[PDB]
Amino acid sequence: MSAALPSIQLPVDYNNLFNEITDFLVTFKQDKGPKYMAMLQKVANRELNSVIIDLDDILQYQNEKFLQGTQADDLVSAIQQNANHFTELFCRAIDNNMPLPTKEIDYKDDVLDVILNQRRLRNERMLSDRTTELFPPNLTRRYFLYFKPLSQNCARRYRISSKPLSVRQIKGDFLGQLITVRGIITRVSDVKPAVEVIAYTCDQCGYEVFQEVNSRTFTPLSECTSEECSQNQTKGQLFMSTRASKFSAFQECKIQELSQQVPVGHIPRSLNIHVNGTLVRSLSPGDIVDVTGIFLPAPYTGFKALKAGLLTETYLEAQFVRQHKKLTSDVEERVMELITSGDVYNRLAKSIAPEIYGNLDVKKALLLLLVGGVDKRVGDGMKIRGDINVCLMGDPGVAKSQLLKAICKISPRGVYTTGKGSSGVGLTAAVMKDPVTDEMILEGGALVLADNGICCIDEFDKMDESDRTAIHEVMEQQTISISKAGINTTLNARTSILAAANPLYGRYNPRLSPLDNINLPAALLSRFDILFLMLDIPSRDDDEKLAEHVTYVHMHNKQPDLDFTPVEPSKMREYIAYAKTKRPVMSEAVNDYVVQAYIRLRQDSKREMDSKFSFGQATPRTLLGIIRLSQALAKLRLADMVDIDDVEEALRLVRVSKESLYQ
Amino acid sequence: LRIIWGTNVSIQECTTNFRNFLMSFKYKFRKILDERDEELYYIKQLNEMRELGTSNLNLDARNLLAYKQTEDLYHQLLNYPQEVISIMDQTIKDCMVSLIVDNNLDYDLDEIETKFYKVRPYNVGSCKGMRELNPNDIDKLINLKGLVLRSTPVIPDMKVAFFKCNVCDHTMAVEIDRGVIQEPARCERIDCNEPNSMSLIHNRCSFADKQVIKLQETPDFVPDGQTPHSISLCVYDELVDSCRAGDRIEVTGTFRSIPIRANSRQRVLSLYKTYVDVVHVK
């Protein structure tokens, strides 16, 4: 055809590369024989479906082409020029060099085994049944291809195509290439079967018409096109087939930017990514990862005249994922380090949150609750209360938020929350709007996902019309539900609560009455166990030490001191998890020592009867809680010594938690 | 024997294989559950439906691995689960005749031999959730554990058609059994009448029930980041109005995928949608 249909003669052809993949036969002997051919044998016997054709096996192959002084064109040139064209000539090189019958499968022990050979022999016998259509090459693969670039000192050896560029500078000549980008993965869809091959049967001739799969919309053909069931007065009417149609994997995801390499201006934007082969089911929402892959745009094929002129809306196609930042099994050496050194009550107290001034009492009150444990295996239908909850109050200026929430971001499964966002109506799950896919899903808040963990809340005066319901419904055992017009199903409730209520204006006046700033009397004096305070009294010696405390962190950048060896958080996590696998059972002398404790708890609380300072009137709900934390501290410090001294550690804590207001 | 283009399955040895499996059983399966009953559960129950009239046999279907034979039956069951139930529905009606031929005084020997029966294999193998559903699982049994959410009323199915053109009287009833209704283009009920207008008297031919039910998996040991997603159901028999929405579920079903029309007014199509087809629920 005329009008500039032919192009200029390009010196870069493909036949010069076509024979250069023919010398990717058994020749690479540096890296037990041909190593990339060794991986070819562990796929044909059907246990793994992902080959890896890296650049390392190309560069070393080009390293030992330093002595053959002949014309060998560059390989990483063309594969960053047009990367997608480097898989179709690749597969047409493997088939001439694939050893087929190297496995042993008799009848079973292979999916889709006797029937493909039944299908192949039904086409092989019909290759000579005249006294004809060859297989398209996509039918018999049962394997995929992959790629992997380099960013090691080989790039500093001698020479780029694998610098981690951001999304921002990428719109130029980087379209149709292989580029890696880091990001944060969001919007994970599901895995749906895509189509790659077809099989129509007409139930007259049985000649299954094959076709290549194009883009996401296509069309079936007629029935008078075949070779046997056609060309007569009767034609078999075509329809589809499921089992004779091989189907692949597919899953869609979207990226954003790291929020540190973004410029001062505009917001970051998304990008579309796809999967093929078997890298599927290996990403997650919240993965600080990077993908390496090849680039191509896509047509739109809808309303293309009025709108959709020459817009492009590209995606990138994935090739490799390099994920990052992830019980008597080669970890017992550090469990012994706590057993040999001992030091439970103090070194572990200095271990969690050593970044404050004083307050060893409250850092001890929390570590017992980070192990929990099954309260009692009740057997009968007596679902007893477990998992006590501690609340705090007071208004320090030491930024109380990063005191508590720093514990939560290292404690297991303990999800952060605040006042805004997941309020007390959206604390549980609900039904909302979704994209054009399956709407009215059960989107959750915190408590339907943070079951049996830490619910670290702040800002207790925020959104209280829904929150005041929300706190009772978890303190009440097992009624986390969705009592909506959609369903009336109820799920579990097993999570501890750590609250920090902020006071009224200025300081909480200690000479005034308490509960001037918390608004829930019924939630507090009967359904909690222990309180604390963060009151500020002027004291000269502490504050200049506190002055050196805050100024020391600025000239240097490090904060550690005071002869404490810092401990890794995995060690106590293993110590908690090992302590959670003990659950000792109490003796009789302990319950003999608490009945006298409760009587002495009863008598003095029944002496004041005043509205000046104190709360509580000695409930058994406080009595059962003091049994709860004792076996908790008997769980973490299990030497099988449930006795008077173990519970003497327990009442040691209830007396110092109480009367924190008397200063 | 008779080998099929579609499957690789056998001929009615499994009928004979079922009878010796069923009759010569009386107890088995103690060897896996060795701790240390003289008649099989199925034998007495086979007499029970005979005098109750019900059409349903809830097969445990965990016996072919506890029986020395019927291994190839057992692994064909997990590999062609549309034909093998259709074979087994012929057996139970004929095995009912095998008890009917003994005493000829058993419900007049006609009416409990016209209404068909059906079987229900369940608890077969195990699965774990939904993040394992690989594309190769095309025609297999799946054992889900999840939550039903909401329902819909029954829409009807096309099991038989009806036709009448503008002659005086024509009451033919064409079958379909496909995705394709086939039509004539010549008249009938006379020897000389042209290609006439054939009309579709829809509200005469009978339809059965069908119901689609939406499911979402129960969030079981989900790693505190993943949202529980969705899948749908399709029932055919009288398991309707018993799967009310809002209860824990364990379904025993096969697998199927369908195409979708991309444009709403064309027949053009390709990310498919799948579902499951329940044989027995719990």
Swiss-Prot record, chain A:
GO terms for biological process: DNA replication; DNA replication initiation; DNA strand elongation involved in DNA replication; double-strand break repair via break-induced replication; nuclear DNA replication; pre-replicative complex assembly involved in nuclear cell cycle DNA replication; premeiotic DNA replication; silent mating-type cassette heterochromatin formation. Keywords: ATP-binding, Cell cycle, Cytoplasm, DNA replication, DNA-binding, Helicase, Hydrolase, Nucleotide-binding, Nucleus, Phosphoprotein. PROSITE patterns: MCM_1 (PS00847), MCM_2 (PS50051). Changing residue 400 to A: Loss of MCM2-7 complex helicase activity. ATP 1 binds at residues 357, 397, 399-401, 502. It is found in: Cytoplasm; Nucleus. ATP 2 binds at residues 527, 621. It catalyses: ATP + H2O = ADP + phosphate + H(+). SUPFAM superfamilies: Nucleic acid-binding proteins (SSF50249), P-loop containing nucleoside triphosphate hydrolases (SSF52540). It is an enzyme of class 3 (hydrolase). SMART domains: AAA (SM00382), MCM (SM00350). The keyword Iron-sulfur does not apply. Component of the MCM2-7 complex. The complex forms a toroidal hexameric ring with the proposed subunit order MCM2-MCM6-MCM4-MCM7-MCM3-MCM5; loaded onto DNA, forms a head-head double hexamer. Interacts with CSM1 and MCM10. Acts as a component of the MCM2-7 complex (MCM complex) which is the putative replicative helicase essential for 'once per cell cycle' DNA replication initiation and elongation in eukaryotic cells. Core component of CDC45-MCM-GINS (CMG) helicase, the molecular machine that unwinds template DNA during replication, and around which the replisome is built. This is DNA replication licensing factor MCM7. It comes from Saccharomyces cerevisiae (strain ATCC 204508 / S288c). The gene is MCM7.
From Swiss-Prot, chain B:
Acts as a component of the MCM2-7 complex (MCM complex) which is the putative replicative helicase essential for 'once per cell cycle' DNA replication initiation and elongation in eukaryotic cells. The active ATPase sites in the MCM2-7 ring are formed through the interaction surfaces of two neighboring subunits such that a critical structure of a conserved arginine finger motif is provided in trans relative to the ATP-binding site of the Walker A box of the adjacent subunit. The six ATPase active sites, however, are likely to contribute differentially to the complex helicase activity. Component of the MCM2-7 complex. The complex forms a toroidal hexameric ring with the proposed subunit order MCM2-MCM6-MCM4-MCM7-MCM3-MCM5; loaded onto DNA, forms a head-head double hexamer. Belongs to the MCM family. The chain holds residues 177 to 467 of 933 of the full protein. This is DNA replication licensing factor MCM4. Present with 8800 molecules/cell in log phase SD medium. It comes from Saccharomyces cerevisiae (strain ATCC 204508 / S288c) (Baker's yeast). It is found in: Nucleus.
